[PDB]
Subunit: 125 residues, 2 copies
């Protein structure tokens, strides 16, 4: 969702008036209201202020929300993300693998990437 | 952890060089480095750019980081409305109703405590 919708949801579902939030944060009602409208976008340090008064972390505040590209191919990133599998792979091995492309084509998903990683490791060792 | 370390972790664990991450994002190589060492913090517009460039979301990117700098509700009262299975069934104005229960500033601690009272009182009213 949008961030202004989320910031309004957190206070309304919690039964709080703008003033209640205003006072516990170091913030005013017009500015907070602008933020819950979404004219302004807040600093991270304003988001701390809001999180802390909602008794929520800033990670958790940003749960339902959304607001580019990608520097590795997505399957390669998924492999880096796998908990059991990923960590065993050198930072080097990621950029080495990442250069593998045939005119656009790339290994599709992480066990594709994992597969050739294993073959390639034997050869380059 | 801290947001500058996290931003340095993502690029380091993917064997990426600053210009990689600077080339898919609007930012400059110098600006990224100042983000990564902690000198200034990025906007939310900037955060999203980096996150997608690491193929994760902004929520996930802040999985780990934390910030420093008071609550408008009791913690357990918040913990309850944040509970996904137990929390949406409670209305904003049951939430207000609960918060006025304190004796000497002493309050129900955990959400089971807040829930226990909600069930009794909701039956009385
Ligand atoms: Cl080619």
């Amino acid at each position: 969702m949008k961030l202004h919708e989320r910031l309004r949801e957190l206070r309304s579902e919690r039964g709080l008036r703008l003033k209640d939030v205003a006072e516990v944060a170091q913030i005013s009602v017009p500015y907070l209201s602008d933020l819950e409208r979404g004219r302004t976008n807040p600093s991270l340090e304003t988001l701390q202020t809001l999180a802390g008064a909602y008794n929520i972390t800033v990670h958790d505040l940003l749960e339902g929300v959304e607001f580019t590209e990608g520097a590795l191919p997505k399957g390669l990133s998924d492999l880096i993300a796998d908990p059991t599998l990923g960590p065993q792979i050198t930072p080097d091995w990621v950029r080495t693998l990442s250069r593998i492309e045939l005119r656009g084509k790339r290994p599709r998903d992480k066990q594709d990437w994992y597969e050739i990683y294993l073959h390639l490791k034997r050869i380059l060792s």
